[PDB]
Design a binder for this molecule. Structure first.
Ligand SMILES: O=c1[nH]c2cc(C(F)(F)F)c(N3CCOCC3)cc2n(CP(=O)(O)O)c1=O
Ligand SMILES: CCCCCCCCCCCCCCCC(=O)O
Lengths: 405, 407, 187, 405, 407, 187
C-alpha cells in the first residue's frame, strides 16, 4: 500500500535533512505520524507518495475526470490517502471517507491588537464623558446657587466672582474671597468635598490605566464583524469559503457576501500568504476568513502578530479516503476512532501546533516596564492652554476697542 | 415499500412531546431538532417513517456479563428498529455493531460557569477605600479640633479675635479639603493645632487616593479562566462532572497532564464536586455564585445558556472532539443514502439553520450579544447626590435667614 | 441669657456623665459571633468588660473578657501589649467621665464664689479634655477589636459615648463663651 | 522474597480501601511502588512484610544486638529492605546498602509568612526614615534662610512666620503672607517644588504598597538564623539531627547547639507532629530543624501554613538494603541507578509529594480584592493629632499664666 | 605492602597544580579538595599512595566500536591505577565495570544567571515619570502664560495694576505648584488665563503622580525565575547548555514535560544557545546582561559564584540528583575500606569542612551574604540638591540686593 | 531709557526673525537612525523639510521628507491626518517668523508717526502671538516624530527656535512697557 499525501504544512513538510538517508524520513508532518499509527493498527506496509497535481481532488464539468489525490485513489494509482482532504458529497459518491480525524470550520483572523498611538484628549479617558458634563453642570449650578444665596441673604459674590470661586475650588487653588454666611459656607463645603473625591478618582483611575494594559479586540464574532463596516473582509478568490458565502441563506453570511462583492478595492486575495500579509499590513483594518487549523498554525508561528477570533462559522471534517469496494476503509475507520478515544490525535495536535510553537503561551509576558509619559499623551492640554491664551488676548483687545469708543 | 420504524430518545431539543400532546398522535405529537431532521432525511431518500421512542429511555450500552446491547443500539442490532435519528455519539464499540453516518453535529466537553452579572457599583461606593470607622472618627476629630482652636484662640482676656467657633469650624473644614480660608492662626497654640490637623489631612487624603488606585488597579487585572488550563491551575473554583458518563471516562483515561490533574482534584475533594444529574449541576452552578464550574457536552451548555434563567455562560473551546450520527444496522440499505443526505443537508446549511432555530430562535434569552475601566456616573453618584442635597439645604437656610431679620 | 447658659452647661455636664457611665456599664457596645459560646460562633453582645452570648443553653450568661489570649512580653513586648493594657483598663473613658464630673462640680461652684471667673474656664478645659479622652478611648477600642469576613455591628452604649463626646464639646463651648462674657463685662 | 518496610508517610500508608479487598494492596506508598519497580528488573517475587516494631534499625550498647528492620535483614527474617533507611557507617558494617535513591539533609521549617497587623506609625512606611529626617532638616533650613534673607535684604517674615509659611507650603494649605523679594521668592519656589515631588512620591509608593503585597521571610538560611535570637530552634528529643548538632565542629552548628542547650523552656519536641504544631501556632517565632523530605511533604499538607527555607545543612541518602551476601544486592544496586537515569524516582517523588498536594502551585490565587483601610492603619496619626491638641492647650495655659504675672 | 597509584584529573578545586610547581615534585606538587580527601582516606585505611594524572585528561567513557574505556575508568579497568580519587560521577555503565564508593558529594543540574546588581537609581530620577519634552514645554508654557497675563492685565490705559511681569511669574509658578499667592486676577482675560493654567497644572500633576505609582507598582511585582518552571514558561531569557555532556543527555532523554520543553527550545533556537566550553557559557552569561541562563553542575556554579568576578548567581534547587564517588577495580581489596572511610569522613564533617574551605574560605568573593520597596534618599536626591542650590542662590541674590542700594 | 528700550526691542525682533528663519532652513533639528539610508538604520540629521544621512556612500545626500508613509482618509480620516498636514506645512513656525517681521515693521514705523502709540501695542501683541505659534509648532513637531528603543537627539536649529521664542516674549514685554510709559506720560 502507498499512502497518497500532499504538501501543506504542518501536515506534510520536507524533513530538516531529507537528502541524507531519505528513505521514508524525507517527509515529516502530522499526516506522516498518523499514517504510521494507522498502518500499525491495520498491519500494513506504507510507502509515501506525493500527488502529481497539487490541486486537491476535483472534477471538471466538461471532461468529467477527477484531478488530484481523488484521481490517484479512484484510478488505482494509490490505495489510501492520508491528507487533510475535506469530506464532501460529490467527493464521497466516488470514494469512501473515514470518520473525521479533525473537525474544523471557517474562522476569522485579525491583526493582534497593540498599543495604539495616544490621541489628543486622551487625558479625559479615566473619567467618562457623562461625568465631565455633569461636572460642568454642577459648576454652573453651584455658582448660581451661591450667587442667589449671597444676593438674597447677604451677611462680593456676584455671578462672575461666584464662578471664579467655584473654579478655583475645583482646581485646588483657593480664592481671594470666601463665604461668610452659613448657606454660602454649606455650598462651599459641599463643592469642596465633591472636588476632592473627583480629583482623587481621576488620579487613581489614571494610575490604574497606566499600571496594567488591557487591550480589547474590536470584534469577537462574525455578527459583530457583520454589522459594522470599518474593517474589511477577505477570502481566497477561489475556494470552499467563497462558495459557502456565495450559496449561503443565513442572513449574516448573505450580508457578508453582499459587502465582499460590492466593496472596492477587491477584498479577495490570490493566496493565503497574501491574506495574512494584508492582515499584518492594515494595522487592524483587515479581517481574513480561512480554515481554523491554518489560522491556529499561523497564530503559533512568528512574527506572532495574528489571532483567531470567534467561533467557527461552519463545520467540516478531514477524513482518510479510500476507493469504493476496497478493504482498508473498514479497518482505518475503527483505527481513527480508537486513536480519538485514546487521545493520540489530541496529542499530535498539541505537539505539532502548540509544542513546536515559535510563539509562546497565552500569557507570554506581563507587567511590562512602564514607559515615561510622552508629549503626545498630554498635547491636548497644551493646545487647550494656548487656545485659552489667544482667547484671553482677543477678549482684552475687544474690551479695549469698546472703551476706545 | 413499507414504513420504517425510527427509534429515538427524549432529550431537549432533539425530541420532546408537543404541548398539545392529546390532540396529536403518531409522528405529529413530537417536536424537536431530530424530528425535522428525520423529515428532511426521509424527503431526500423518499421513505415513509413511523417514529417511536426507546423503551429503555437511554442510549446504547453493553452489559458486561450478559453482553446485551441496551437502548437504541439494542433496538438496531436486534431488528426492532431500522434507523436511529438521535444524538447518538459515534464510538468505537458502537461503530462495530452498527453503521454510523457522517456527523450531523460536532461537539465536545466544555466548561459552564456562573454568568458574570452587571454589578451595580453601589451608591456611596466612593467611601469604600476607607472604613466607616475612619470617616466617623474624622468627623469627631474635626469637631474636637474646631473646639480646641476656638478655645486656645479666644479664652485669654487680653484678646477680649476672628477665631470664633463658627469660623473655627470653617477653617478646619477648609483645611481638610486642602482649601484655605481667609483666616489663619497667629498664636503658637492655634498654629500647633493647625499643623497637626494639616498633617492628619495630608496622610488621610493620600491614603484615600492610594487605596482607590489599588482598588481600581486590582479590578483591572482580574482575568476569568477562559480555558481549562486557567481552571486547572487555580484551586479557588471547584469544577465537577457527572458521576456516570463519558466525561468521567475521558478524564480517567486521559494521558494529557491537565485532564489527569483535573481528575486528581475531582476524586480528591470534599464535598464531592460531582453530581448525580445534570439539573443538579446546573442548579449548583447557579447557587454557588461562581464557586462551581460544570463540565459537560457543549450542546447542552449552549441550550442551557439560552434557557430562562439566563444566569450561565460557556467559556473556552471544546476540550475534546466528538460527533453525533444517524445509525443503521449492519447490512442495511439506508446507510449510503442516509450519509449522502446528511452531507447534502450540511452543505445546504439545513443543519445550521435547525441548530439556530431550536437553540436560539426558540431561546428564552434570545440574545447573542464595552470594557473600558473608565469611571462611570454610577461610581461617583453619591457625591453628586450630596452636592444636590447641600445646595437644597443652603437655599432652605437662606430662606430661614431671610424670614429671620423680619424685624 | 447668662443664667440659662449656665443651666444648659450644668444639665449637659450631668447628661454627658450619665451617658458615659451607662455606656461603660451596660455591655452592649458590639454585636458579633465569638465561638466562646455555641465554627463561625454564636451571636453575642460584647461590651467593655464582659461578653454575653445569647444563643444556646448559655442564654443570659455573661463571662468576663480577658484581653490576653496569647503570649507576649509582660514587661515590654511591643506596642500591642500597651494597647491591650489600655483597652483592658479603659482608663480613657473613665477619665472622660471623671473630668466631666469635675467640670460640673466647678460649674456648680461658680454660682457661689461668683467673683472668681476662672472656675468656668477650668470647667471648659475639663470638658474639652474629656472629649479628647473619649476620642482616644474609642480609637483604642476599635483598634483592639481587629483580629488581624465576620459581620459585626455596634450597639447603643457606643452611641451613648458618642453623644457624651458631642455634649461635652458643646458645654465646653458654652463655658468658654460664658467666661468671655464675664471677662468682657469686667472691662 | 519479602521486602521489609516501616510505616511512615508518604512511603507507606494504609490503602484507602484496605478494609475491603485488601489483597496485597493493603499497603501503598512511594516505597511500595519502588519495590515493585525494582523487583521487576531483579526478576523476583516480593511480598511486603512490615516489621512488627516501628523502629528503624539500631544497635544496643549492652546487648550488642540489632533491633528493627536491620535486625530482620541481618538475622535472616527478611530478604530485602525498601524502607527509607539512611546510609551510615554502623549499619553498613553489618549490611550492604545500595546507591542512594534519594538524597536529603537537615532543613528548616518555618511558618509561612502572613500579613502582620499594621503598627501605629505605619503611615510612614512608604518613605524611609532618612527622608523624613532630611525633610525636617530642610524645613528648618528653608525657614532660617527665608528669615535671614527677609531681615538682611528686606523689600513680616520673622522666624515664627517663616516656619509657618514653610509648614503651610509643605502641607498644601497656602499662607496669609507671601514673599515679595526675589530671594524670598526663590526660596519659596524651590520649597514648593520639593513639597510637590515629595508628596506625590508618598502617595505613589503608598499605592504601590497597597496594590501588591510582598511578604519576605525573616530568615533564609542557618547563618542568618543563628545570628539572631528572636526565633527558637527545635530538634526532636532523640534523633540523628540532635546528635549531628551535638557532634558538630562547624561554628554555626556549635552556636546552635549552645543556644539549644541553654535556652529555656525546652525547645525540643517529643514528636514531629509537636514540632509542626509549635511552628503552626507560634505565629512565626518557631523554626523546626528536621529532614528535608518530611518538610517538603508537609509543605503540601493542610492547613498549608508552613514552608521550607534555605538549603540543607548536611548530606544524607536513603538506600534500599539487602542482607550481606545476597544475590539481590547487585541487581537492586543496578536497578536504582537505572531508575535514576530513566526518571522513575523523580516521577514517584513528584507523584507522592507535589501531585496529591492538598495545596496548589506556588500561587493558586493572587491580587485578591483589596481591603478597605482600617483605623489601625491610621491610628497613629489620630494619636499625634490628639497629643498636639493637648500640647496646644497646655501651651496656651502656660502663656496665660506667664502673661498674668 | 606497596605504594598504590591513584589516578586523578585536573579540575578546579578538586586537583590543580600548586603555585610553586617547580619547587615541589610528586604528590606535594598538587593542591585541592581531592588531594586532601585522598590523604584522609589513606590515613583511615593506612596505605601509602603515589598520585598520578590521567593522560587522556578526561573522564571515563566507552568508544562505541572499539569498546575501549578511556580516561580514569580505562586506567582502572586495565590495571593502570588502583584508585581514582576524583569527581567521577556514578553511572550505570561505569558501576558495572568498576566498584564505586558511597558518594562524597551530592550535586545536580542547576541554573546560573547574571547577578542582580545594586542598581543606582540615578540623580534626577524623580523626572522619569514625565519625558524631558514635557518638562521643557512646561517651562516655556509658564513663560508664555506669565507674559500673556501681564499683557492682558496691564496694557489698557484705564488701569495706568498689581500684575506686573514679576508678579505674573510668581502667580504662574504658585499656580503650577498648587500654592496660591497674595494676588488673583480680577479681569475676565486674566481669569481665563488663570483657569487654563490651573487645568493644565491639575492634569500634569495628576499624571506625574499616577505614572510614578505605575512605575513603583511594576517594580514591586517583578519576580525572578527562582526555578526551572519559571525559566521554561518565559521566552525572554535564553537558557543554554554545553553541546556535549551529560546535561544534553539528561534533557534529551527526559520524559518530564518541562525538561522536554527546555530541549525543544534549545534545539529550536538561533543563534545556538549552546556553547562549546563552560568558560564560554560563563562569559556569555556575564556579557549578555541577564539575557542568558547557563545550566550546569551545581558545584562548578558555586565555585564560579565564589570566584572573581562576583557577577553570577545560582538560582533554584538542583534539577536532578547525582553523586561523585571514589572508584576502584572490580575485585579490589580497597573497596570496602574506602567506602567506610568515606562514610566516616561524611559523618565527622570532614567533607563539609573541605567543601567550605576550597569553595568559600579560598573564595575571592568571600561573602555568603533588605527588600522594603520604601523610597530611599537616593530616589529623591536631585530635589534635595535643587533645594540646596536654590537656598544658596537666594543668599547670593540677597547679598547682591544689599551691595546694590549702597546709595 | 525709552530710546535704548526701543533699540533693544527692534534688535531683538530682528534677531528672533533671523534665528527662526535659520532654524526653519538648516535641517539640523533631529539626529537619529532612519533606515532610509544604509536594520537599525544609518545616522542622519533630519530637519523640518528634508532628511540628510551621513553614513555610507550616500554622504551629504539630502532627500525630501514625505510625511505620508501610510494610507489614511485624505478628506477627513482622524486627527492624525490634520497633525501630519500641520507638521508638513509648518505653518506655525512660518507664522511666528511672519508675525515677528510685522512686529519689527510696526516698531520701526513707531519712530515716525510718533504721535500714535497703539503701534507699539500692536507690535507687542504680534510678538506674543508669535511666541504662542512657536509653542504650537514645537509641540506638533515633537508629537509627529513619535513612531508609536531608538536613541535620538536635537540639534541647533531646535534651540535656535527656542531662543527665538524667548526673545519674542522679552521684546513683547519691552514693547508693552514702552506703550505703558507713553500712555502714562499723556496723563
Ligand atoms: O479537500 C480540501 N482540503 C483543503 C485543505 C486546506 C488545508 F486544510 F489547509 F490543507 C486548504 N486551504 C489551503 C490554504 O488556504 C486555506 C485552506 C484547502 C483545501 N481544499 C480547497 P477548498 O475547497 O477551498 O476548501 C480542499 O478542497
Ligand atoms: C524661567 C523664567 C524665570 C525668570 C525670572 C527672572 C526674573 C525677572 C523679573 C523681571 C522683573 C522686572 C520688572 C519689575 C516689575 C515691572 O516692572 O513690571
Amino acid at each position: 500500500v502507498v499512502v497518497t499525501t500532499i504538501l501543506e504544512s504542518p501536515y506534510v513538510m520536507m524533513k530538516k535533512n531529507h537528502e541524507m538517508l531519505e528513505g521514508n524520513e524525507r517527509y515529516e508532518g502530522y499526516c506522516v505520524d498518523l499514517a504510521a499509527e494507522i498502518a500499525k493498527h491495520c498491519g500494513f506496509k506504507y510507502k509515501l507518495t506525493i500527488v502529481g497535481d497539487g490541486k486537491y481532488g476535483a472534477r471538471d464539468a466538461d471532461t468529467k475526470i477527477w484531478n488530484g489525490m481523488v484521481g490517484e485513489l479512484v484510478y488505482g494509482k494509490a490505495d489510501i490517502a492520508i491528507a487533510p482532504l475535506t469530506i464532501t458529497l460529490v467527493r464521497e459518491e466516488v470514494i469512501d471517507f473515514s470518520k473525521p480525524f479533525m473537525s474544523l470550520g471557517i474562522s476569522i483572523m485579525i491583526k493582534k491588537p497593540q498599543k495604539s498611538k495616544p490621541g489628543v484628549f486622551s487625558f479625559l479617558d479615566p473619567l467618562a464623558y457623562e461625568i465631565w458634563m455633569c461636572i460642568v453642570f454642577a459648576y454652573i449650578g453651584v455658582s448660581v446657587v451661591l450667587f442667589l444665596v449671597s444676593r438674597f441673604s447677604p451677611y462680593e459674590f456676584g455671578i462672575f466672582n461666584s464662578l471664579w470661586f467655584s473654579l478655583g475650588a475645583f482646581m485646588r487653588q483657593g480664592c481671594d474671597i470666601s463665604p461668610r454666611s452659613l448657606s454660602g459656607r454649606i455650598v462651599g463645603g459641599v463643592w469642596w468635598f465633591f472636588t476632592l473625591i473627583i480629583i482623587s478618582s481621576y488620579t487613581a483611575n489614571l494610575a490604574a490605566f497606566l499600571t496594567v494594559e488591557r487591550m480589547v479586540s474590536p470584534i469577537e464574532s462574525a455578527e459583530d464583524l457583520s454589522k459594522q463596516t470599518e474593517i474589511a473582509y477577505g477570502t481566497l478568490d477561489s475556494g470552499s469559503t467563497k462558495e459557502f458565502f456565495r450559496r449561503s441563506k443565513i442572513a449574516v453570511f448573505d450580508k457578508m457576501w453582499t459587502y465582499m462583492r460590492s466593496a472596492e478595492p477587491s477584498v479577495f486575495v490570490r493566496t493565503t500568504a497574501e491574506g495574512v500579509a494584508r492582515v499584518r499590513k492594515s494595522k487592524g483594518k483587515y479581517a481574513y476568513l480561512l480554515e481554523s487549523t491554518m489560522n491556529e498554525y499561523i497564530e503559533q508561528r512568528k512574527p506572532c502578530d495574528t489571532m483567531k477570533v470567534g467561533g467557527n462559522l461552519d463545520s467540516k471534517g478531514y477524513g482518510i479516503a479510500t476507493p469504493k469496494g476496497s478493504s482498508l476503509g473498514t479497518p482505518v475507520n475503527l483505527a481513527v476512532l480508537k486513536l480519538s478515544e485514546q487521545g493520540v490525535l489530541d496529542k499530535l495536535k498539541n505537539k505539532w501546533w502548540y509544542d513546536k510553537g515559535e510563539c509562546g503561551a497565552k500569557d507570554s509576558g506581563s507587567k511590562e516596564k512602564t514607559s515615561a509619559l510622552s508629549l503626545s499623551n498630554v498635547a491636548g492640554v497644551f493646545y487647550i492652554l494656548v487656545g485659552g491664551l489667544g482667547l484671553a488676548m482677543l477678549v482684552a483687545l475687544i474690551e479695549f476697542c469698546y472703551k476706545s469708543r | 415499500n413499507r414504513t420504517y420504524i425510527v427509534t429515538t430518545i427524549l432529550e431537549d431539543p432533539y425530541v420532546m412531546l408537543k404541548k398539545n400532546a392529546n390532540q396529536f398522535e403518531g409522528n405529529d405529537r413530537y417536536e424537536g431538532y431530530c424530528v425535522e431532521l428525520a423529515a428532511e432525511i426521509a424527503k431526500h431518500v423518499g421513505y415513509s417513517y413511523r417514529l417511536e421512542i426507546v423503551s429503555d429511555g437511554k442510549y446504547g450500552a453493553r452489559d458486561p456479563d450478559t453482553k446485551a446491547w441496551n437502548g437504541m443500539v439494542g433496538e438496531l442490532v436486534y431488528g426492532r428498529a431500522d434507523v436511529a435519528v438521535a444524538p447518538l455519539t459515534i464510538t468505537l464499540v458502537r461503530e462495530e455493531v452498527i453503521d454510523f453516518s457522517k456527523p450531523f453535529m460536532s461537539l465536545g466537553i466544555s466548561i459552564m460557569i456562573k454568568k458574570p452579572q452587571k454589578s451595580k457599583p453601589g451608591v456611596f461606593s466612593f467611601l469604600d477605600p476607607l472604613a466607616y470607622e475612619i470617616w466617623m472618627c474624622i468627623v469627631f476629630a474635626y469637631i474636637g479640633v474646631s473646639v480646641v482652636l476656638f478655645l486656645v484662640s479666644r479664652f485669654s482676656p487680653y484678646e477680649w479675635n476672628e477665631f470664633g467657633i463658627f469660623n473655627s469650624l470653617w477653617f478646619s473644614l477648609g483645611a481638610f479639603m486642602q482649601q484655605g480660608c481667609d483666616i489663619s492662626p497667629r498664636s503658637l497654640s492655634g498654629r500647633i493645632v493647625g499643623g497637626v490637623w494639616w498633617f492628619f489631612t495630608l496622610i488621610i487624603i493620600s491614603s484615600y487616593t492610594a487605596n482607590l488606585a489599588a482598588f481600581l488597579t486590582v479590578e483591572r487585572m482580574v482575568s476569568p479562566i477562559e480555558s481549562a488550563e486557567d481552571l486547572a491551575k487555580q484551586t479557588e473554583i471547584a469544577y465537577g462532572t457527572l458521576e456516570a458518563g463519558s466525561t468521567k471516562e475521558f478524564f480517567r483515561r486521559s494521558k494529557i497532564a491537565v485532564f489527569e490533574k483535573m481528575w486528581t482534584y475531582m476524586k480528591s475533594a470534599e464535598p464531592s464536586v460531582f453530581v448525580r444529574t445534570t439539573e443538579e449541576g446546573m442548579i449548583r452552578v447557579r447557587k454557588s455564585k461562581g464557586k462551581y464550574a460544570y463540565l459537560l457536552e457543549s450542546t447542552m451548555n449552549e441550550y442551557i445558556e439560552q434557557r430562562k434563567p439566563c444566569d450561565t455562560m460557556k467559556v473556552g473551546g471544546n476540550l475534546d472532539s466528538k460527533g453525533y450520527g444517524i445509525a443503521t444496522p449492519k447490512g442495511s440499505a439506508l446507510r449510503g443514502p442516509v450519509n449522502l443526505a446528511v452531507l447534502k443537508l450540511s452543505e445546504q446549511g439545513v443543519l445550521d439553520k435547525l441548530k439556530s432555530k431550536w437553540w436560539y430562535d426558540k431561546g428564552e434569552c434570545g440574545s447573542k450579544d464595552d470594557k473600558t475601566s473608565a469611571l462611570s456616573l454610577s461610581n461617583v453618584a453619591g457625591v453628586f447626590y450630596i452636592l444636590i442635597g447641600g445646595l437644597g439645604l443652603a437655599m432652605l437656610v437662606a430662606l430661614i435667614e431671610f424670614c429671620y431679620k423680619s424685624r | 441669657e447668662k443664667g440659662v447658659q449656665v443651666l444648659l452647661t450644668t444639665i449637659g455636664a450631668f447628661a454627658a456623665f450619665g451617658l458615659m457611665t451607662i455606656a461603660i456599664s451596660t455591655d452592649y457596645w458590639l454585636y458579633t459571633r465569638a465561638l466562646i459560646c455555641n465554627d463561625p460562633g454564636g451571636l453575642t453582645h460584647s461590651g467593655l468588660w464582659r461578653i454575653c452570648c445569647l444563643e444556646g443553653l448559655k442564654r443570659g450568661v455573661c463571662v468576663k473578657i480577658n484581653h490576653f489570649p496569647e503570649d507576649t512580653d509582660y514587661d515590654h513586648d511591643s506596642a500591642e501589649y500597651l494597647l491591650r493594657v489600655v483597652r483592658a483598663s479603659s482608663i480613657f473613658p473613665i477619665l472622660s467621665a471623671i473630668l466631666l464630673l469635675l467640670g460640673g462640680v466647678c460649674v456648680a461652684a461658680s454660682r457661689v464664689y461668683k467673683s472668681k471667673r476662672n472656675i468656668i474656664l477650668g470647667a471648659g478645659i475639663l470638658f474639652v479634655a474629656a472629649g479628647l479622652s473619649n476620642i482616644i478611648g474609642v480609637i483604642v477600642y476599635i483598634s483592639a477589636n481587629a483580629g488581624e469576613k465576620n459581620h459585626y455591628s455596634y450597639g447603643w452604649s457606643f452611641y451613648f459615648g458618642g453623644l457624651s463626646f458631642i455634649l461635652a464639646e458643646v458645654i465646653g463651648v458654652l463655658a468658654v463663651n460664658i467666661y468671655i462674657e464675664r471677662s468682657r463685662e469686667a472691662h
